[PDB]
Design a binder for this molecule. Structure first.
Ligand SMILES: Nc1cc(F)ccc1C(=O)O
Lengths: 359, 358
């Protein structure tokens, strides 16, 4: 009877069981708003809670089976519906970039994403507002829970680097957290993280995706969620949501002043290829120590063929090149190298850690 | 433990593959995992939340693939539910059943029970009707007394028996709450007619709600009842019975191939009646009409009483199925004779008395 009811949710699920399916991209937006209302108001241990988890499970599964949650317009409406339950950052009116992946690629490489974001943030004229999650920033002695829509505006003016932990912004993602665990299958939610940036001022971004087949739809989705933001969608050919240190990577270029694809190889950066096995994660604590006491403290050099160092330089070089409007990959390398050895990258990180500590 | 959420999840994943990797025996095994897990959901705990999430996921994925519209899947689903059933063991006439899937959005009179009773008064015929009884319940019959253990006692001396489904199929009891919560059709919606606990039944009418379903539903009926001559019926107004208005398609399984023909009340010498004239007056009222207005002999062929015509027609189809011909007007004469001889009221009365002295 009320729009925000099991009855309304059921009617949207029934559009999904029709041949062909009759669920529009805007219906998916509307359905997700009903699911989030139904889940936020859940009465613990009530029959109503079981019935609701039943109908949300049913909807989300139907949506996976039809594959409409892999269509650009549907991904965008889904991100938009989720964002309605989010704390967005209100800022008073350098190039501001984000770098992040969908995940879901079944890989466990070093956190190059946060590392490149920190090294890029050391380059004069760049500002980095990375949205993610992760624990890595956690283990450098700053409470990431202190960073929310209320504190980001205080941190914003004097910081070249910032990290936003998604769960402290996206209360809608918090509401589906338990049913996602219970479902144990991928859903539309597995690909929304990168399209939920709560800072409107971000100009450019690298968005990594787990699959070649998603990339073109994810590029069209990114264009709809971040209108006029110049964007690389990246897919490493080995199956990786960032620029791979082995083999090729494809870039899908959303260029608002112009769709177009181009191919990246480590040789274009003046770097050796490295196998994924040589570029592994040692978990958050050790990743952070490696980053802070080795990479950012200048223990390694361009030309040392240190695999992790190379991997971070390359991802940094793409951030720089994206930021300046050119494909001079070796120049982004030089700029990444200078950010580290000048101490600027470590200073950018330390200033953000001190800033957070002060809240 | 193999009967676990993790095992169910792996079955759901088979359904999300392109193309799906869920075989019909996979559905059988998945359904035993489901009925086992749902048995443990006696509270609204988080474990229950989790199990309902995964069963809903599985059942919904099955519906959207449409594997639950395929005969092999429907038969394997029936076999899995029957594992949780009390089945009737009998010592080794024609024995008939008449029942529908429901799910047609109609609210028509209980013509199956009524036609089963009238048919049971035609000499040579034995009726063991299986159904979801509330009607026969209100005629002073303790239908809980009719179970696995008591059916063999009632079998020898009764031309008519009614078997109330929820007292046989514990497995259906377990999925009752989640099916209500799902609000969408699943495979469970079409299993009722395929769950008969007496294997000696050798002919039946099974109504379906959909033209589209009927062909695959006839195949499933042939897999579930290999030793059975069967009519699947769909009234074109959208009805799981021989319709008192417009045409009814019949799919015929003759275990000698899917034969088809068409029924129209004129073939029975009957006027057409709108569904509105053949409405369900509720269990207590339906039982009153059937025993007072119909089995008493108050109405005859030619009175054009809608309920009475509706019962005569469905009885006549049972008779013709039983005899291996299409003499529909002979069917009417045999039905009219079972009502007006009193033989029908007596057959029902014998059963109610058999159950009373149990
Ligand atoms: N709830 C049921 C119980 C039975 F024994 C047989 C069928 C059903 C049904 O819901 O159709």
């Amino acid at each position: 009877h009320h729009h925000m009811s099991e009855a309304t949710l059921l009617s949207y699920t029934k559009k999904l069981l029709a041949s062909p399916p009759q669920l529009s991209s805007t219906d998916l937006h509307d359905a997700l708003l009903v699911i989030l209302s139904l889940l936020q108001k859940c009465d613990t241990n009530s029959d109503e809670s079981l019935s609701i988890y039943t109908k949300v499970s049913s909807f989300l599964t139907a949506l996976r089976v039809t594959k409409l949650d892999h269509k650009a317009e549907y991904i965008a409406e889904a991100a938009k519906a989720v964002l309605r339950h989010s704390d967005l950052v209100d800022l008073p009116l350098p190039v501001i970039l984000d770098i992040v992946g969908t995940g879901g690629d079944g890989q466990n490489t070093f956190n190059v994403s946060t590392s490149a974001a920190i090294v890029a943030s050391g380059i004069q004229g760049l500002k980095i507002c990375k949205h993610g999650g992760g624990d890595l920033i956690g283990t450098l002695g700053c409470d990431m829970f202190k960073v929310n829509s209320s504190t980001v505006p205080k941190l914003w003016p004097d910081n070249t680097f910032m990290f936003l932990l998604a769960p402290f912004f996206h209360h809608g993602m918090g509401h589906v957290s338990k049913i996602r665990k219970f479902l144990g299958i991928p859903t539309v939610f597995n690909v929304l993280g990168p399209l939920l940036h709560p800072v409107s001022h971000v100009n450019k971004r690298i968005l990594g995706v787990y699959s070649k087949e998603l990339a073109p739809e994810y590029a069209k989705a990114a264009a709809l969620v971040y209108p006029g933001s110049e964007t690389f969608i990246v897919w490493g050919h080995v199956g990786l949501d960032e620029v791979s240190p082995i083999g090729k990577t494809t870039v899908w270029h959303i260029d608002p002043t112009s769709l177009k694809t181009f191919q990246l190889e480590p040789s274009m950066f003046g770097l050796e290829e490295h196998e994924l096995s040589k570029c592994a994660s040692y978990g958050p604590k050790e990743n952070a120590r490696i980053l802070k006491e080795e990479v950012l403290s200048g223990k390694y050099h361009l030309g040392d063929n240190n695999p992790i160092y190379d991997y971070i330089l390359m991802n940094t070089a793409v951030l720089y090149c994206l930021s300046q409007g050119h494909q001079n990959w070796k120049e982004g390398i030089i700029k990444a190298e200078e950010s580290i050895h000048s101490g600027n990258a470590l200073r950018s990180l330390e200033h953000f850690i001190d800033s957070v500590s002060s809240l």
